[PDB]
Amino acid sequence: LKENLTQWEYLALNSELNIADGHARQALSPGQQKIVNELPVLWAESEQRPVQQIESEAHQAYFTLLGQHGYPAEPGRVLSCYSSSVSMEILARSLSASVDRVALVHPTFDNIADLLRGNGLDLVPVEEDALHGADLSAELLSSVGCVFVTTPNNPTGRVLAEERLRRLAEQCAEHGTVLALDTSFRGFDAAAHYDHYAVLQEAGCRWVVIEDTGKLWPTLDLKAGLLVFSEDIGLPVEKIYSDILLGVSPLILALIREFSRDAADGGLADLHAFILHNRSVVRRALAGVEGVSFPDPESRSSVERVAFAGRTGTEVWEELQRHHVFALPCRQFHWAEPSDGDHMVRIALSRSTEPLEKSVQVLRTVLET
Amino acid sequence: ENLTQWEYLALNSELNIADGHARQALSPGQQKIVNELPVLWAESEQRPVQQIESEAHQAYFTLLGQHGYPAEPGRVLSCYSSSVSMEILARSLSASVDRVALVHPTFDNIADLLRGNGLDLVPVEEDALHGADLSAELLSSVGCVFVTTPNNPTGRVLAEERLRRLAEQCAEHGTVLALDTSFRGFDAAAHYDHYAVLQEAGCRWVVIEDTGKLWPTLDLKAGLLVFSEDIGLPVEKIYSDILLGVSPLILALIREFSRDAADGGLADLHAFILHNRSVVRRALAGVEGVSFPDPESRSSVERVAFAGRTGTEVWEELQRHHVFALPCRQFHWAEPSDGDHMVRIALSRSTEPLEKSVQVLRTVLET
Ligand SMILES: Cc1ncc(COP(=O)(O)O)c(/C=N/[C@@H](CCCNC(=N)N)C(=O)O)c1O
Numbered sequence: 001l002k003e004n005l006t007q008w009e010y011l012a013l014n015s016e017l018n019i020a021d022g023h024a025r026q027a028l029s030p031g032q033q034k035i036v037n038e039l040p041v042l043w044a045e046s047e048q049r050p051v052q053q054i055e056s057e058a059h060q061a062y063f064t065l066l067g068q069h070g071y072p073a074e075p076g077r078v079l080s081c082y083s084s085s086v087s088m089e090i091l092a093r094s095l096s097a098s099v100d101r102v103a104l105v106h107p108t109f110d111n112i113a114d115l116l117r118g119n120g121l122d123l124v125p126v127e128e129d130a131l132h133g134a135d136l137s138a139e140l141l142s143s144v145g146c147v148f149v150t151t152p153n154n155p156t157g158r159v160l161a162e163e164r165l166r167r168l169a170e171q172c173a174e175h176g177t178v179l180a181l182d183t184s185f186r187g188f189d190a191a192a193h194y195d196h197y198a199v200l201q202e203a204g205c206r207w208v209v210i211e212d213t214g215k216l217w218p219t220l221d222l223k224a225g226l227l228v229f230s231e232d233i234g235l236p237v238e239k240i241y242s243d244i245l246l247g248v249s250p251l252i253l254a255l256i257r258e259f260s261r262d263a264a265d266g267g268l269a270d271l272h273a274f275i276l277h278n279r280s281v282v283r284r285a286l287a288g289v290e291g292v293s294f295p296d297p298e299s300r301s302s303v304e305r306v307a308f309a310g311r312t313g314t315e316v317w318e319e320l321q322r323h324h325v326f327a328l329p330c331r332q333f334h335w336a337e338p339s340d341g342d343h344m345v346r347i348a349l350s351r352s353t354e355p356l357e358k359s360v361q362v363l364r365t366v367l368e369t
Numbered sequence: 370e371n372l373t374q375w376e377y378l379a380l381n382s383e384l385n386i387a388d389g390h391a392r393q394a395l396s397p398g399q400q401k402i403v404n405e406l407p408v409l410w411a412e413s414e415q416r417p418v419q420q421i422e423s424e425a426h427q428a429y430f431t432l433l434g435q436h437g438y439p440a441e442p443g444r445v446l447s448c449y450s451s452s453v454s455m456e457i458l459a460r461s462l463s464a465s466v467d468r469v470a471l472v473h474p475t476f477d478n479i480a481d482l483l484r485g486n487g488l489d490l491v492p493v494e495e496d497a498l499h500g501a502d503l504s505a506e507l508l509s510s511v512g513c514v515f516v517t518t519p520n521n522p523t524g525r526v527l528a529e530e531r532l533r534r535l536a537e538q539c540a541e542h543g544t545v546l547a548l549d550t551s552f553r554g555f556d557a558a559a560h561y562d563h564y565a566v567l568q569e570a571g572c573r574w575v576v577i578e579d580t581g582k583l584w585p586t587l588d589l590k591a592g593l594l595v596f597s598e599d600i601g602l603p604v605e606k607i608y609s610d611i612l613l614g615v616s617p618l619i620l621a622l623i624r625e626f627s628r629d630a631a632d633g634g635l636a637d638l639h640a641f642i643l644h645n646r647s648v649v650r651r652a653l654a655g656v657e658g659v660s661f662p663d664p665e666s667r668s669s670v671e672r673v674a675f676a677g678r679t680g681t682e683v684w685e686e687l688q689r690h691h692v693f694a695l696p697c698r699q700f701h702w703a704e705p706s707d708g709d710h711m712v713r714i715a716l717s718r719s720t721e722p723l724e725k726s727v728q729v730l731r732t733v734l735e736t
Contacts, residue, residue, distance in 0.1 A: 003606055003609070004606075004609055004610065006609040006610070006612075006613055007609050009613055010609075010613070013417070013418055013419065013613070013614065014417035014418065014419045014420075021613055023613070027414075028414075036406075036407050036410050037407050039403075039406040039407060039410070040403050040404050040406060043403050043406070043587065046587050047394075047587070050380075050381035051380060051381065052380070052381050082449035082450065082453065083449065083611075083612060085610070085611050085612060086449065086453065086611065086612075089456065089611060093485065093486075111610050111611070114610045115610055115611070118460060118607065118610060119460075218414075220410065220413050220414065220616050220617055220618045221613075221614070221615070221616040221617070222616050222618065222619075239371075240485065242371060242373040242374050242377070243371060243373065243452070243478050243481045243482055243485060244450075244452050244453065244456060244478075244482070245373075245450060245452055245453075246373055246376055246377070246380070246388060246390070246588075247380065247588070248588065249587045249588040249589050250587055250588075251587045251589065252589075
């Protein structure tokens with residue numbers, strides 16, 4: 001009855017032991033609370049300055065924070081959207097003007113698949129081993145108009161390394177295909193902080209990148225998706241963007257600027273340390289527990305997959321929910337073959353440690369019948 | 370090209386009277402809310418979002434007379450904007466509906482979002498929509514009838530008896546009735562209970578409410594997508610493909626601005642818009658060839674008609690004096706020449722830059 005992962009996440013939104021959706025719900029740091037305390041000042045600034053200047057500063061702060069020095073800073077090359085999913089809707093509807101089929105990494109967050117399919121695009125799954133380990137086949141590239149990679153991936157944390165991004169961008173250029181990247185989880189893993197725009201521009205392929213500020217910091221879902229596109233993209237992303245919105249709030253852009261600056265001043269290292277700590281408490285707690293394993297040993301992402309033998313993720317979810325703990329079954333990340341995820345749940349790590357600890361102790365007991 | 374692309378040219382300019390968003394100064398009661406934003410933040414971290422959301426919806430719907438709205442969780446879908454609501458609706462229509470009857474003129478992204486999602490449009494002129502039943506031929510040929518009320522740019526309000534009849538006609542033809550009520554807060558004639566009428570007629574229906582145009586909240590807002598239990602369209606599914614929900618801080622802000630409005634802010638807003646409308650009309654009163662096509666509009670946008678000049682020529686001349694209005698062609702999404710001789714002026718502005726802007730227009734029109 002839960003048609004997608006988001007509908008599983010609705011069930012958790014009002015519980016103290018929500019470890020389902022990937023949004024950041026941990027406490028603000030002291031430096032971040034100082035930003036919140038200055039919100040009336042940021043409001044006045046947002047009333048008094050031209051939005052283009054605030055937007056330019058927010059983009060500069062965020063892209064430079066994460067190593068993306070080559071981003072196109074000319075006004076209009078980075079489209080600020082209400083969310084990365086709104087960017088994805090724009091991209092999907094734009095793709096459907098001239099593309100029939102999209103090669104898409106599998107598993108990935110399911111609304112990428114569902115927005116693409118919903119706009120009439122046929123999807124070809126590319127498993128992670130194929131995507132990272134070998135060139136894509138000429139047969140595949142000639143049959144699709146776009147290759148879409150989430151990196152770091154959700155739910156696996158896998159990062160497309162620079163050499164492979166380069167080869168993929170070269171392949172797309174050679175075939176005329178759009179390379180599209182979703183880099184929502186970029187901030188969590190320094191392996192994703194090499195300059196992606198430099199690679200893409202040097203390869204000369206048609207490209208689109210959707211950045212997202214929404215997953216890094218606990219900003220009560222105040223965020224923007226940033227839809228960045230090559231000059232030759234050849235899709236009507238600018239026109240469809242303008243059908244949907246005039247722009248985002250200057251106050252949100254100012255918040256993104258301030259949170260990015262705090263992150264540059266040591267907040268980002270603290271975040272990495274915090275996620276590492278929370279991953280450690282989860283793995284320590286599901287220690288022995290016969291039948292339990294962690295499919296993504298090297299992930300640095302803010303979500304964590306847990307696998308179990310002889311139990312189903314939906315079953316674990318129901319036993320968990322009877323104790324008011326809400327996680328996420330993994331089936332629907334495997335948008336082309338949901339049974340691939342039948343024996344996994346996903347746990348959200350962007351949480352205060354104490355509620356996370358309590359939820360994982362509950363899972364330890366459950367997983368011990 | 371669309372109206373939004375004209376609006377981008379004005380966005381960083383002092384004499385922007387183009388887009389309809391609210392850009393006047395906060396009232397003192399509203400500035401008090403902004404001063405307490407750190408408290409609203411703490412509330413949003415601590416309380417379940419469902420409680421804040423229910424309170425925001427209750428405050429906003431009751432403020433505007435919509436007491437029969439479906440208050441069960443999940444019947445009102447909070448979206449980042451009304452245009453996001455409209456994208457969800459357009460996409461949800463496109464599998465089962467080929468043709469939509471749409472009020473003409475209206476704001477052009479309604480037409481562009483519908484067309485962009487594969488729907489063919491059939492214009493319905495305002496005098497026909499309000500003045501008489503729709504024909505059986507039209508209603509049997511369309512899967513949805515879409516009415517903006519109060520309309521943008523005309524301010525025209527669908528009266529209760531005509532809404533009732535339209536909903537009855539849509540029910541008897543199996544047609545979805547969709548309303549965009551984004552400008553509801555401005556005109557008390559739109560504060561009779563629309564949900565009572567829709568539920569009583571028993572057609573399949575969708576209403577898109579919008580908080581964005583009423584208050585100067587730096588574009589912090591929600592579109593509210595409300596639907597009948599039997600709508601038969603994938604609005605809930607496609608909504609969930611796009612978002613988990615809106616920020617609890619924005620919902621708390623809507624609740625507080627709605628409460629301020631219920632305490633007298635809404636009366637003050639109506640008096641403020643009436644004052645700015647009076648400024649425009651007094652300023653242009655005696656100019657040769659100018660008329661006001663919508664004398665009873667209470668909307669926050671104002672149409673100005675002039676003979677012997679195209680709204681495009683007038684826009685061009687204003688732009689040289691750094692004033693940005695809107696040519697009206699593109700609101701007439703089926704027949705753009707219908708709007709060749711009008712421009713639209715935004716009234717949700719501090720009175721001082723509005724007066725400065727209207728003074729340029731007066732002198733441009735007099736010379
Ligand atoms: C009747 C009606 N229904 C919905 C909306 C969307 O409101 P939103 O912008 O989503 O908050 C509007 C917008 N009216 C403004 C701003 C247009 C901004 N451009 C795009 N949205 N593409 C205007 O008339 O200038 C409307 O009139």
